């Protein structure tokens, strides 16, 4: 029974394809939160109703510290308003821009929090399929929080920088999608670029399907081992989030 007049809106937190995320405070409780204002125009013209519902669906019943919470939603005659947890330290995307690349301690800790959140999600057959820095938010304690479950789906289903080969090639894909993305992320955190970056979508597609990536010298063998395990063309060869959390390079550098 919410309404746009229940909130004071302020700082824009980010511009999206279908709308914008705004800082907002609930007038009666003074509760600070983010308001994602999606436009039905663009949404309907794209047919992302099940995507939007699945986002509200999944992210509502997903309660986890390393997952951005969705408190509720409402809509008027044009826009759809998602009332989201506010992440005061912004995106991991912005932090990479700021720090260029991450040390093994910060990286291994974000990977740990990711695997936890992803382990909670996979235990419910929920697979994100869009794990990338701009969807990784930071809480007040710097804790990583996965957001944007638009492309989230249950069980198997059917840029490119973070998508595994099965997805970009259209095949059927399961939880192992996020394990691949996790390896792409681990790489981007240490190197500052994702491993299959190219100047064109068509080049990146080739590099992903062939799994053509090389490590800079400053990438330690421990991180290389984890990443090579996650970036296996074959989803079944990719580890599970538990070999990842139990991977010696993680336990050595993670503060969790």
Numbering used by the authors: 127 to 284, 292 to 389
From the paper:
A plethora of X-ray structures and functional assays led to the general notion that dephosphorylated Aurora A and, more universally, Ser/Thr kinases are in an inactive conformation and that phosphorylation or activator binding induces the active structure. Our results are consistent with other crystallographic studies on wild-type, dephosphorylated Aurora A in its apo or nucleotide bound state, where the kinase was also found in the active conformation. The following observations support our hypothesis: (i) two crystal structures for the apo-protein show Trp277 in very different environments, (ii) Danusertib has been proposed to selectively bind to the DFG-out conformation based on a co-crystal structure, and (iii) the same slow step is observed for binding of both Gleevec and Danusertib. The broad line shape for the Trp277 peak hints at severe exchange broadening in the surrounding of the DFG-loop and is consistent with the high B-factors for Trp277 and its neighboring residues observed in all crystal structures described here. The number of crystals for each structure is one for apo-Aurora A and Aurora A + AMPPCP and two crystals for Aurora A + Mb + AT9283.
